[PDB]
Amino acid sequence: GKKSKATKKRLAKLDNQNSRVPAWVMLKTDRRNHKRRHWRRNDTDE
Amino acid sequence: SWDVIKHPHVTEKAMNDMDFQNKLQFAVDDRASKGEVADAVEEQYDVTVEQVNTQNTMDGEKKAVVRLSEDDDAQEVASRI
Amino acid sequence: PVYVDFDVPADLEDDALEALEVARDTGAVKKGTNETTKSIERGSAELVFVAEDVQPEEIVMHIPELADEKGVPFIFVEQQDDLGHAAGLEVGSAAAAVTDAGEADADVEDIADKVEELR
Amino acid sequence: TVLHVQEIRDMTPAEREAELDDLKTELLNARAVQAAGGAPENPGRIKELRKAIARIKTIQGEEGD
Amino acid sequence: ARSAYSYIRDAWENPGDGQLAELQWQRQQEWRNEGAVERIERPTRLDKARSQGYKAKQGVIVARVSVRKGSARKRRHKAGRRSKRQGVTRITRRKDIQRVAEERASRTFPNLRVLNSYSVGQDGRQKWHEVILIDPNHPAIQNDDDLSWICADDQADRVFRGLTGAGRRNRGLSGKGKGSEKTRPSLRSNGGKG
Amino acid sequence: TGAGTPSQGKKNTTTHTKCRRCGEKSYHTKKKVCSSCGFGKSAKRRDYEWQSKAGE
RNA sequence: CGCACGGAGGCGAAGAACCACAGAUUUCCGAAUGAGAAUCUCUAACAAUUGCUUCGCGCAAUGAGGAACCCCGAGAACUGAAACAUCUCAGUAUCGGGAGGAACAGAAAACGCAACGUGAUGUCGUUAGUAACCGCGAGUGAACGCGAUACAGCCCAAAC
RNA sequence: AGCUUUACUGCAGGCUGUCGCUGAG
Numbered sequence: 052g053k054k055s056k057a058t059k060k061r062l063a064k065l066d067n068q069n070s071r072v073p074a075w076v077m078l079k080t081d082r083r084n085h086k087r088r089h090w091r092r093n094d095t096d097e
Numbered sequence: 098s099w100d101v102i103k104h105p106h107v108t109e110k111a112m113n114d115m116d117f118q119n120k121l122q123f124a125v126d127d128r129a130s131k132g133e134v135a136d137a138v139e140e141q142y143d144v145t146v147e148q149v150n151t152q153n154t155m156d157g158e159k160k161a162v163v164r165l166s167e168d169d170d171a172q173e174v175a176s177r178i
Numbered sequence: 179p180v181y182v183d184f185d186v187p188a189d190l191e192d193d194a195l196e197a198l199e200v201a202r203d204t205g206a207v208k209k210g211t212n213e214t215t216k217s218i219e220r221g222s223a224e225l226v227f228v229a230e231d232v233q234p235e236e237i238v239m240h241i242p243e244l245a246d247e248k249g250v251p252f253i254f255v256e257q258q259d260d261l262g263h264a265a266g267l268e269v270g271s272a273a274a275a276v277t278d279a280g281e282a283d284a285d286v287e288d289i290a291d292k293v294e295e296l297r
Numbered sequence: 298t299v300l301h302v303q304e305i306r307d308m309t310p311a312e313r314e315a316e317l318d319d320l321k322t323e324l325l326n327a328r329a330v331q332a333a334g335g336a337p338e339n340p341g342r343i344k345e346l347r348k349a350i351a352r353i354k355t356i357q358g359e360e361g362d
Numbered sequence: 363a364r365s366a367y368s369y370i371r372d373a374w375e376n377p378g379d380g381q382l383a384e385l386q387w388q389r390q391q392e393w394r395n396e397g398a399v400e401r402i403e404r405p406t407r408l409d410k411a412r413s414q415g416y417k418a419k420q421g422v423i424v425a426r427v428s429v430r431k432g433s434a435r436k437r438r439h440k441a442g443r444r445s446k447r448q449g450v451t452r453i454t455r456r457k458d459i460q461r462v463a464e465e466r467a468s469r470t471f472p473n474l475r476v477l478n479s480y481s482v483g484q485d486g487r488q489k490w491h492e493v494i495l496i497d498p499n500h501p502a503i504q505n506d507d508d509l510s511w512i513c514a515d516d517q518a519d520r521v522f523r524g525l526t527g528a529g530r531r532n533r534g535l536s537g538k539g540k541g542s543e544k545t546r547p548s549l550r551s552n553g554g555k556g
Numbered sequence: 557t558g559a560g561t562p563s564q565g566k567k568n569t570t571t572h573t574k575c576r577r578c579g580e581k582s583y584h585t586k587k588k589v590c591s592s593c594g595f596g597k598s599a600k601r602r603d604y605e606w607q608s609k610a611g612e
Numbered sequence: 613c614g615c616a617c618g619g620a621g622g623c624g625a626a627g628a629a630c631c632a633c634a635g636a637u638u639u640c641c642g643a644a645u646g647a648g649a650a651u652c653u654c655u656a657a658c659a660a661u662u663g664c665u666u667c668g669c670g671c672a673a674u675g676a677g678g679a680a681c682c683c684c685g686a687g688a689a690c691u692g693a694a695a696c697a698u699c700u701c702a703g704u705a706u707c708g709g710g711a712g713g714a715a716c717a718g719a720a721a722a723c724g725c726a727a728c729g730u731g732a733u734g735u736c737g738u739u740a741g742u743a744a745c746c747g748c749g750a751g752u753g754a755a756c757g758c759g760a761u762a763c764a765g766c767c768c769a770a771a772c
Numbered sequence: 773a774g775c776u777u778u779a780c781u782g783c784a785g786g787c788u789g790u791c792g793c794u795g796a797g
């Protein structure tokens with residue numbers, strides 16, 4: 052498929068959102084990303 | 098108002114282009130053309146830009162690979178910052 | 179057009195308008211259909227003017243027959259702004275009436291006669 | 298902090314613009330050093346550099362430049 | 363004495379007789395070739411227009427509108443319906459043609475507001491009404507003690523809410539007594555039974 | 557050919573996409589109309605009374 | 613130095629944090645309005661429809677939203693009648709158009725306790741399940757008046 | 773509920789008269 056510049060930005064963001072909760076936030080809050088998406092198991096929009 | 102140059106894209110591959118091809122890589126604003134990236138660079142570093150190659154990265158930012166003239170030396174330029 | 183039963187020769191219309199101009203400066207005139215209509219009804223009308231380029235025509239249709247059953251003479255004018263101008267207005271005028279001319283009583287008289295003859 | 302409101306207002310239009318371009322450059326070089334993962338940072342200032350620029354720009358607006 | 367206007371009025375009491383008759387037989391020929399909404403420089407029925415609020419002034423507009431004659435243009439049911447609700451031919455709309463005309467006009471002039479309207483005849487298949495509209499934003503009107511009322515915000519889209527004269531009549535609000543139990547203060551507050 | 561699993565294999569066509577107006581993945585890229593907000597069909601936002609219980 | 617209690621660092625007696633009012637900034641798409649487009653792109657823009665008009669987009673208007681309420685239009689069926697067609701469900705559900713902080717109504721071609729009487733309009737209580745409707749079946753169903761709330765009365769067309 | 777028909781009742785549609793558009797001898 053041929054992705055446009057806008058689609059690319061969105062995919063880009065989705066990839067970034069697909070990261071973990073940094074270790075320090077765990078400490079800073081005396082102690083989970085409910086939006087973890089797998090390329091295979093999940094399905095993005097568009 | 099948005100600025101053209103965001104910051105230097107420093108990575109191993111960026112170094113090779115710098116040490117071996119007199120090229121500097123930058124993260125630039127995605128609304129910037131090669132020509133604008135060229136000027137901005139010459140102005141911010143006082144050098145002569147020969148060629149500019151761009152790429153819209155999977156990071157949401159636009160990457161520019163800028164080649165300097167033989168007069169200038171990428172390594173030396175990158176060092177002052 | 180529907181209320182017009184006879185064509186007034188350009189020259190005649192010229193004379194008529196002339197008399198009108200002197201009528202305002204020497205005697206008295208009424209400008210506007212409402213005022214004209216009241217002259218014919220009150221009898222104080224000597225000669226009434228009606229434009230032929232009026233739209234809607236209902237505005238004037240009643241003049242012809244009204245004037246007849248009052249003996250009051252009437253003449254047609256092609257333009258509407260020409261009659262309005264003659265009466266001395268900056269705007270046009272659908273109809274006007276010479277309420278007692280002035281140093282034109284002679285002319286008006288002949289014009290009234292010239293028209294009767296024009297049937 | 299290091300730069301105050303008065304000091305900015307006591308400047309001349311041309312002094313603010315010059316000070317602006319200065320700050321921008323410092324900012325750009327702070328970001329560059331961060332791009333290289335350079336640790337000689339001082340996180341408190343890169344944060345300040347942005348507020349300063351905001352202030353200078355804000356005053357230019359107020360002063361009609 | 364009679365006003366000149368009274369003659370226009372007296373002629374329109376019988377649009378099928380006299381000069382007016384010949385006038386209509388002629389105009390309608392041009393009318394049938396004009397469009398749905400035609401702005402006109404002067405009211406065809408001066409007495410009526412002025413009587414309804416008209417004024418030779420800036421911001422006062424007039425447009426003739428033609429609407430088809432007859433009952434509702436209805437589509438037969440495409441699902442189950444009891445005999446009572448299976449009609450098509452005899453169903454008529456609850457809004458009269460004059461009201462349809464006032465609305466089509468107002469939509470043509472989005473910035474204007476309907477002041478009133480009056481009939482100017484009909485041929486075998488359509489009716490024409492002349493609608494008087496007002497520019498609520500023109501200072502010539504904002505400063506007119508007789509019309510500035512139509513400038514208030516609550517007069518926006520008045521025709522679409524039936525605040526027009528033909529609207530209120532069609533809403534059965536004419537009578538103030540017997541027969542208006544389900545009409546005043548509004549059809550909707552009365553459960554829509556008017 | 558079974559209308560089930562075997563007919564699921566040809567489904568590689570893109571229709572509903574992220575909508576420029578409402579952000580929902582309902583913009584039919586072939587019809588150029590959003591099934592959710594009406595973008596491309598209506599200037600007004602798509603909305604119906606049946607989207608909730610009658611007395612609410 | 614947000615939720616957010618880490619690490620590093622910073623800001624605050626030049627009175628910060630924080631709160632109130634006011635102002636600055638305010639990307640792209642979006643009524644979306646130069647044109648096109650799944651939020652991007654292409655070469656000056658009130659697109660479109662109107663009013664005024666210096667007849668030039670010069671000055672203006674409209675568009676879309678909003679919890680429901682409000683006004684004007686379109687308008688079912690399940691159901692009840694122990695079947696069912698009128699009737700009923702119901703002018704309900706749902707649909708089209710539109711206003712405002714409230715809408716709508718409103719100063720009698722009224723009422724008609726018939727009077728030597730009342731006196732704009734909403735609304736509340738009542739009048740009353742009365743009058744009236746109805747395969748005179750099932751069902752449907754007011755008003756005048758009265759007691760209250762709140763009160764407010766005016767402008768044109770024409771004559772001259 | 774789908775279907776049928778000289779089942780009951782209706783509704784589109786076609787045909788036809790009449791009125792309007794519609795006038796002169």
Ligand SMILES: [Cl-]
Pocket residue numbers: 468474475476518519520521522
């Ligand atoms: Cl309106």
Ligand SMILES: [Cl-]
Pocket residue numbers: 730
């Ligand atoms: Cl009483």
Ligand SMILES: [K+]
Pocket residue numbers: 444
């Ligand atoms: K039923």
Ligand SMILES: [Mg+2]
Pocket residue numbers: 066
């Ligand atoms: Mg990654």
Ligand SMILES: [Mg+2]
Pocket residue numbers: 151152
């Ligand atoms: Mg490329």
Ligand SMILES: [Mg+2]
Pocket residue numbers: 559
């Ligand atoms: Mg199947």
Ligand SMILES: [Mg+2]
Pocket residue numbers: 644
């Ligand atoms: Mg656009």
Ligand SMILES: [Mg+2]
Pocket residue numbers: 693
């Ligand atoms: Mg039953």
Ligand SMILES: [Mg+2]
Pocket residue numbers: 547548551716
């Ligand atoms: Mg109400």
Ligand SMILES: [Mg+2]
Pocket residue numbers: 693749
């Ligand atoms: Mg029974």
Ligand SMILES: [Mg+2]
Pocket residue numbers: 752
């Ligand atoms: Mg009922």
Ligand SMILES: [Mg+2]
Pocket residue numbers: 540755756
């Ligand atoms: Mg009563």
Ligand SMILES: [Mg+2]
Pocket residue numbers: 773
């Ligand atoms: Mg059955």
Ligand code: NA
Pocket residue numbers: 089090091092093094095
């Ligand atoms: Na996937």
Ligand code: NA
Pocket residue numbers: 103124158
């Ligand atoms: Na970056």
Ligand code: NA
Pocket residue numbers: 468469471472473474475476
């Ligand atoms: Na309008």
